[PDB]
Write a protein that binds this ligand. Structure first.
Ligand SMILES: Nc1ncnc2c1ncn2[C@@H]1O[C@H](COP(=O)(O)OP(=O)(O)O)[C@@H](O)[C@H]1O
Ligand SMILES: Nc1ncnc2c1ncn2[C@@H]1O[C@H](COP(=O)(O)OP(=O)(O)O)[C@@H](O)[C@H]1O
Ligand SMILES: [Mg+2]
Ligand SMILES: [Mg+2]
Lengths: 586, 586
């Protein structure tokens, strides 16, 4: 049983790359700068003590000031050299720190892309925004505070213990040890209490800000129902709660600082009083008193932030463990063990006794079996909740069937590589998304090495090349958010051009026209009929009139195949498809 | 320059609430605690200097050991009392600070709700989240640093100048003043340079995080086209750019700290050398050396944060000026001074020669005039660019016509109060949004004092009460984002129930069923026909079959009224409406 250390040890390869010489040399130089700065900050109070002694004794300077002048100049130069070494170590190590955190983030990103519905379960705007906005900052803060506050403070504490032992290590060493122990214990307990209060304050702040954002984003609704006063009172109550929580949190912070100062000042009083008492017996000089003062101040100056340091290090460790846990996530999606590549020569589709559900307590597909001939035009229709979008998702193997299988060209898609499987399939879903880039990039996204000629051919096949030609920047016009806005038909056409760039043998149109206007619907339906020239096409449409010209139609009811056949045959059977068509006919 | 001064002058009423009591006593107590803490931190180095003097001389009315012990105990007690006074001032002032920031945020929110057009111009995704998350933070840090670091430092600097003059020579004062001036100047220049580099770093960080979020949110699309490697490389390039920018920023911070330490330690060397030189000539005592040391350290330790303080003060002033500008924003559509409340006795609608456009360079409504009789069921149809949603928006007076007007019950809507006008109108738009709360709240949002019984009646009239009854938590079920997800039909039903709770005499259905399924479409169309019992109803639909039963049909083309009449009459006319109906016949 062990954590924390384990986590830091897994992180250490990122800090210690063993692939970049320069970075290891920089880590060594940073440690050397740590040592130099600590040595200088320990040496300068000795210089101050010797200057004071020269002012109170005769020393080795005949005017006695020369030694004092030299030593006060040495004290000032030591302060400057300590700060210089600290900033030099920061400068040298910052590159290694940034590179380590960047590599960790890249690994987490690459693993996230491999997870496949670990997100479909949780894709809340708040969760995504919070995670992606916090991840790097938490680690940066934890790493910096740990490496450049705990280790330097530990080194300084050990060196101060040694020096304090050599020079009256009878009682002051015990006193400083007791003071450090009490300080750390009190800081830790009060910091845990303060972290509880801080979490409550942060929750209230998030609630108030979320209420404000929801109000401003729904301004149209507020005006529609005249709820300005109600929303104002709501936000005012939330802000009052947040203010009370913040007041209590800052009062707890004040108590923490008061206790810290009490401990520190008790140690200072004891040490200085004991030192001057020893001076009265002639044991020690006054420079020893100033020495003790400066040593204690230099020791406890980093510990002033100790509560914040502890809290931030804890949070960073938690978040780093979270990142490693995300990396150590099993991929339920595909087995693909030594899988051979899928070779689609005749693009047929087979559903063999497919039984599937999202959760074990509810069941969707009760043994659905059907055949889609290669090159045929097939439609998939059904009422709400029929599960045809689940058919679309299972064809791409977003899930694996519990009891059944899916075949492409007669080959089970569960036994082939995901790359070859998804390379043979193109899909245009109901809600098509555009990347935040130029139209040229959005169209070329279909294939990696996509050339300009292929992009032009796809824009021509999607009947959108003329629309792009009329744009001022042409293919370099940025679309999506923070860019040029496109109509729903334009988004669907860009998606069609993307899938054409991909050029897959099998195509799925999942309610492509479900939210377009009738003119645009007819235009893009003609475009889709044109694009279905030499491909196997499956059109999952809600409106039956849009797919009446299909080679065959599959009617789904309650997750099973109720009816199959051509439009005229299904109408003549006077069944479920005929009932739906009759309802929609007028 | 002077904008920050005007900003602080505008803020001062919030900090010092002239017309307000008790919080002013809190402010006075906080200032008194500031004064006590500064006095104690100035007094303790005198105790240290006198302790050193007692240790270096052999005289004194009382035993040198007694006086030395008393003075070191006084020094420790002064340190403790200074920290105690600082924490007490923080605790006392936190209430006033939180209340002032809350009142500022409330005023900004209230003024933001009283603006109509500027929302659409500023709807960027990062825009809203960034401003809402950052405004209060910026104000808080700037206020804290100003009131508790700069002003105490100014008091301490004046007191240190006075004490150095009274107890030391004109030259120590001259040197410390020149050093403070050089420190401030260097800090200012380097902090401006650092703010430039830091802004570049933040922009690159935002770009990298936005790329990561866009990749992860479009995971389905990335899998559709097998672009995992491309997305990884894009994120890696963005992260490398961000890492380089961060490295340069932290190197600039190191340079700033190096310059600050150089100035401070040059002043320290000069002052200490001058003090020991004056002591060697008998001008000053040896305790004066430690006195000067402690005074300079206590003065310049808070100035270590001067760069961050300056940057935060600048950002807070900018953001506060921006908030005050938001409060001092002119309303486009403002009420007339003595506007009477709208009295709807006969809910007719009249558009007389309405000419309107969003921008003066483009024009949408080319003098549209029409009459909607009270209690009648009217439909408004047209192509995608006809501009009928602009009719819907102008009915609610989101804008004012350029040349023309709109009447409700014979009264110009531009001459009545906005509240009564919008209270007399209810609207169900195509994309209805839910507030982040329970369904009971989402339905009761129609009216302020909406009861649970009114919610039940509205859910019954919207044919959604049974759907809510089958939910486990019933009306207390949280819906919308970060909650239970509802289908488009369910959201439209909740919106209809909301408008029913409002119970307005005039209803507008703006393409409410354009994205619903057929069974839900028929159910919600029957619901709309039912709820139109004693109300004037205007149904703006693109699909003619959904509004064929309307009393009359208004056909819009190119922003003008092309055809008017009933469904049968317009079909008989064989015009534009007949052409659209024939095209849709399918
Ligand atoms: N992420 C999910 N978690 C749980 N249940 C789901 C999820 N997605 C879909 N379902 C359920 O599975 C069913 C699948 O039907 P669906 O494919 O949506 O039909 P259609 O394609 O006609 O809308 C739906 O009724 C829905 O209730
Ligand atoms: N906020 C806006 N600023 C500028 N132009 C707009 C804005 N909103 C819409 N438009 C343009 O004005 C026209 C208004 O049409 P609209 O009434 O939205 O059509 P519909 O009634 O079919 O929704 C649209 O063609 C659109 O291009
Ligand atoms: Mg679907
Ligand atoms: Mg509209």
């Amino acid at each position: 049983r062990h954590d924390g250390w384990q986590t830091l040890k897994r992180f250490l390869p990122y800090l210690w790359p063993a692939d970049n010489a320069v970075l290891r040399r920089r880590v060594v130089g940073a440690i050397l700068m740590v040592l130099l700065g600590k040595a200088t900050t320990l040496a300068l109070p000795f210089a101050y003590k010797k200057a004071v002694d020269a002012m109170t004794l005769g020393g080795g300077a005949q005017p006695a000031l020369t030694v004092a002048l030299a030593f006060v100049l040495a004290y000032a130069l030591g302060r400057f050299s300590g700060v210089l070494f600290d900033n030099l170590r920061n400068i040298v190590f910052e590159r290694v720190g940034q590179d380590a955190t960047r590599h960790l983030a890249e690994n987490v990103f690459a693993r996230l892309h491999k997870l496949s519905l670990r997100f479909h379960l949780a894709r809340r705007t708040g969760e995504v925004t919070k995670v992606i906005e916090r991840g790097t900052k938490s680690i940066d803060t934890m790493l910096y505070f740990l490496l450049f506050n705990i280790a330097p403070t530990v080194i300084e504490l050990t060196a101060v213990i040694v020096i304090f032992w050599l020079n009256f290590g009878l009682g002051l060493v015990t006193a400083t040890i007791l003071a450090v122990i009490a300080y750390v214990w009190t800081t830790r307990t009060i910091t845990e209490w303060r972290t509880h209060l801080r979490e409550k304050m942060n929750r209230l702040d998030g609630q108030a800000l979320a209420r404000a954002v929801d109000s401003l984003l729904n301004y149209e609704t507020v005006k529609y129902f005249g709820a300005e006063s109600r929303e104002e009172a709501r936000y005012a109550s939330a802000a009052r709660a947040y203010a009370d929580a913040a007041v209590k949190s800052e009062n707890s912070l004040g108590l923490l600082n008061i206790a810290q100062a009490l401990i520190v000042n008790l140690l200072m009083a004891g040490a200085m009083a004991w030192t001057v008492y020893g001076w009265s017996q002639g044991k020690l000089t006054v420079g020893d008193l100033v020495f003790v003062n400066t040593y204690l101040t230099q020791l406890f100056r980093p510990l002033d932030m100790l509560g914040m340091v502890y809290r931030t290090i804890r949070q960073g460790l938690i978040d780093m463990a979270e990142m490693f846990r995300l990396i150590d996530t099993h991929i339920e999606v595909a087995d693909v063990p030594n899988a051979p590549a899928l070779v689609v020569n005749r693009p047929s589709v087979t559903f063999d006794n497919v039984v599937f559900g999202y959760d074990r307590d509810r069941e969707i597909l009760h043994g659905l079996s059907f055949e889609v001939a290669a090159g045929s035009r097939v439609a998939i229709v059904g009422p709400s909740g029929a599960g045809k979008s689940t058919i679309a998702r299972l064809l791409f193997r977003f899930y694996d069937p519990w009891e059944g299988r899916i075949l492409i060209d007669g080959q089970d898609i569960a036994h082939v590589t995901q790359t070859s499987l998804r390379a043979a399939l193109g899909i245009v879903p109901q809600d098509s998304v555009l990347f935040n880039d130029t139209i040229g990039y959005n169209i070329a996204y279909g294939r990696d090495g996509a050339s300009r000629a292929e992009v032009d051919a796809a824009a021509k096949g999607a009947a959108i090349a003329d629309f792009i030609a009329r744009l001022p920047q042409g293919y370099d016009t940025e679309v999506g958010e923070r860019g040029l806005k496109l109509s729903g038909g334009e988004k669907q056409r860009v998606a069609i051009a993307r899938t054409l760039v991909k050029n897959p043998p099998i195509l799925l149109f999942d309610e492509a026209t479900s939210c377009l206007d009738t003119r645009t619907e007819q235009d893009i339906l003609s475009t889709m009929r044109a694009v279905a020239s030499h491909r196997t096409t499956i059109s999952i449409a809600h409106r039956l009139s849009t797919i009446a010209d299909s080679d065959t139609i599959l009617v789904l009811d309650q997750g099973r195949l109720a009816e199959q056949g051509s439009h005229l045959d299904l109408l003549r059977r006077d069944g479920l498809y005929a009932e739906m068509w009759a309802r929609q006919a007028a």
